[PDB]
Every structure is written in C-alpha cells, then in structure tokens.
Amino acid sequence: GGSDGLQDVTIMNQDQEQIIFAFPPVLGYGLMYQNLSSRLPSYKLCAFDFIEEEDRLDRYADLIQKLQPEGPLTLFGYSAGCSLAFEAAKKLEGQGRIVQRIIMVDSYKKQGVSSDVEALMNVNRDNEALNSEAVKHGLKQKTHAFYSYYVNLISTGQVKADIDLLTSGADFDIPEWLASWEEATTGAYRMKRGFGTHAEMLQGETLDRNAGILLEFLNTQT
Amino acid sequence: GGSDGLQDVTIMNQDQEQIIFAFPPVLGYGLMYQNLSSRLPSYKLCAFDFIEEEDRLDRYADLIQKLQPEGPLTLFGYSAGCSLAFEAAKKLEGQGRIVQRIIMVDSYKKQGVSDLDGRTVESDVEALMNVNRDNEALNSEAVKHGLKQKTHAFYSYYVNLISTGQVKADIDLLTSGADFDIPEWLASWEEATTGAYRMKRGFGTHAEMLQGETLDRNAGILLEFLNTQT
C-alpha cells in the first residue's frame, strides 16, 4: 500500500468484464501490450510490470486476488513473461485458485540456467511509451533484473491449467536449457503457428495476424 | 461395393446423429472399438477395417462421402490408424471436404521407414496378435480367417509409410501414461497441421488405453476434445 495498491500494473480496456492477467516481455513493462489490447477489445487486460523483489510472486498473487477475487483465472505471457506467468500460475494454484489457462507467445519452459534481450532492446530504442518520466528512471534496472531472473530460473513442477502456445512464423530449435510445455501441465497443451519472428509478434502488421489466433485461444470452451 | 457396400465398415451407436469416422489399430479391425463406443454414447462411430488394396484412400473417401455427404468431418485413429486418418484427411480436403479435426490416440507421424532393429515384420505381427489374443472383438470366423493377413498388410504399410504435407484440420492427441522417446523415424503432429495441435496426457500403457478401467478415464478426455468449440 502506501502510495497506491495498483502499483506495478496497468489496466487496459477497463469497461470490459473478462480479465486477462498479462506478464511482460523481458524489458519489464506492461505498457508494451497497449497495442495488443486494441486487438482484444472484448477483454480487460491487467498488464503487470516486472516486480524485482524476491517475493514478487506473493505480490502478484495479492494484486490478482484484489483485481479478480473469484472465478477461474486466465494468464498471458510473451518472452520472459511466459516463464513468469507459469511461476505465477503455480503460485495461484498453490493458494487454491483455479487457473483455467495460460496463453504463451513464443517462449518455452526454463529447464536449466544455460537471450532475446538485445533484439527487444533494439526494437524500442526510441519508444515514446518507455520514455515517460516514470519509466525512464527505472528502465535500465528493471530490464536487467528481469533478464537476471530469467537466465537463472529453473521451472519445475506442473500446473493444472491448460496451456496455449502461439509459435513464431520462423523455424526454431529448442535449446538444451529449454523445453516444451507438454510435461508442464496435466491439462491440455495446445499450439498453433503464428506470424513473424519472435521479437515482432505483438507489434505492427504481424500483430493483427497473431491477435486473431490469440482470440481463437481465448474464445475456446468445453 | 459389390455384394456388400459396407464390407469394410462397422457402424456403432446407430441411432445417434453426430458421426466420427474411425480408423483401426494395427490389427486392422474396426470392431475393436466396440467398447469405446459405449463410452461415447452421443456419437455414431463408423469404424473402418484396413483396406488392403493400393487404392484404399479413394475407397475410404468414397465411403465417407457416402456415409456423410455434407458438413464438417471428424476423424479418429489409434495406433497405426492415426497415420491412415492423416492420409485420409489429406485426400478428403483435396476433394473439397472440410475436416474439422482428427483425434489421435498415442501414435505419431511417420517421417521415415520404421527401424525394426533385429526383428522382422513376421515376428512383430505374431506379437501384435498375442497382445490381443484374448479380445472378443477378434472372435468370429470373419476376423479370424483374415486377421493374420490384414495385420501383416497394415503393419507393412505402416512400417514403410512416410507421410508428407499438411492438413488444415485441428489435431488432438491423447498420449499414454507411459513415458516414451519419439524415434528418429517418427515426429509429432505439430508441423502436420496449419490449424491447432493439442495434446493431453492420458492413462495406461499404449496397449491398454482403450480397454478396461483405463478406457473409462481416457474416454473422458476424448469427450473433452470432441466437446471443444471456438
């Protein structure tokens, strides 16, 4: 608390009812999903920034409990945000919440300590959004912190939530320190090939193409 | 069809409206799905036998067009039947039909000729007929009179098959509870479809998935696949 409870989160499409909790790419800022939000008009997006503190999972769970206290949860991630979303899902399920699904955009499960940081940094070298006073101050440190978290992370266990993965239009060979999400869920693991290279999937013209597939994932039911 | 237009098909849950076209396990007889049919009461199963002739794909296409002239198609396969379903789906989409989805049960895409190590088709066939030596579906002089020949033909087909291309249909895969490392001559169905590829871990070993109590649990997942809308 103190200054505000909505610390580290940006709400988009605020008049919608269905909520998606989105974890940021490696740069660390949820504002990077502003354009994606315009392509998911029927969904309210609670876009998180990367929380650097060691108890970040407790903080995210607390924010989610406040933003959507009841009902099944839908999480989303892109880049390093995919691993963070997986870790947040385990945290939430361990608290007794039901996570219906996690939507992942072209990133895999961390299997060992030992990458798209420079590409993403190059993309937004001169991005107005990340130029505000609030961001400029902590941008360098937040990106470094998220990068450090990702490289050292080793994700274990499973979630019950279904996992949907939108893969890049380009070919990719899974590294030894990475793995598919197949064994990471006792639910259904679904994937569909999208458009563009990893670093451009949620921006420009490829975004329009990819948003359509993300809506297919979201509009799925049994 | 000759004197029997439905010689290579067995219809189950005949009073139902929604149809599932099912391709048989390597033994080659659709009747082996009788137990499964009781767990999918809302679907009419048109279970095919393995057609030994080289124009089998055209024959399957003809039968499906006859059994369901219009509307999206749903195909199903288990074991080697998964490969046949994929090959049949390609044929069907080529004819303008819409294949909504293909449900696969613990089997992968052929990427090359199967490596039988120090074994032979002959010995593997004898074994495949032993794993199911006690199965009521394999009774009757009908199946017994040609079980060997049909299993040999289907296994030979499977071993030498190399599947290429893609389908637009979504592909759902139910995997067995037993661990497994995909061999060099096999591949996941990921690149085989321009649609969505979905998989879920099921129960039991490969050979016990569609029988006994294991069937009861796995059927629940298959129903999840079938009841999917978007």
Specify the structural class of chain A.
Answer: alpha/beta
Q: Give the helices and strands of chain A as they follow along the chain.
A: EEHEHEHEEHHEEEH
How many structural domains of chain A?
2
Helix percent band of chain A: 25-40%
What is the CATH homology-level superfamily of the largest domain in chain A?
Alpha/Beta hydrolase fold, catalytic domain
CATH class of the largest domain in chain A: Alpha Beta
Query: Over the alpha carbons, how many angstroms does the gyration radius of chain A reach?
Result: 16 Å
Euclidean distance between termini CA atoms of chain A: 39 Å
Provide a count of the helices of chain A: 6
Strand content of chain A: 15-25%
- DSSP strand tally of chain A: 9
| Biggest β-sheet: strands ordered side by side in the sheet of chain A | 1-3-2-4-5-7-9
Function (chain B): Probably activates a leucine.
Region (Thioesterase) (chain B): 18-230
Organism (chain B): Bacillus subtilis (strain 168)
Family (chain B): Belongs to the ATP-dependent AMP-binding enzyme family.
Core attributes:
homodimer, 222 residues, 7-stranded mixed sheet, Helix Hairpins
Describe it.
Chain B: This is Surfactin synthase subunit 3. The structure is a homodimer. With 222 residues, chain A is an alpha/beta fold. Chain A has two domains: 172 residues, Rossmann fold, CATH 3.40.50.1820; 47 residues, Helix Hairpins (Orthogonal Bundle). The first copy, chain A, is 34% helix and 20% strand. Chain A contains six helices and nine strands. In chain A, the strands form two sheets. In chain A, strands 1-3-2-4-5-7-9 form a seven-stranded mixed β-sheet, with helices on both faces. In chain A, strands 6-8 form a two-stranded antiparallel sheet. In chain A, α1 links the parallel β2 and β3. The longest helix of chain A is centred in the middle third of the chain and has 20 residues. The first copy, chain A, starts with 8 loop residues before the first strand and ends with a helix. The interface between A and B is medium-sized, with 14 and 14 residues. β9 of chain A pairs antiparallel with β9 of chain B, so a sheet runs across the interface.
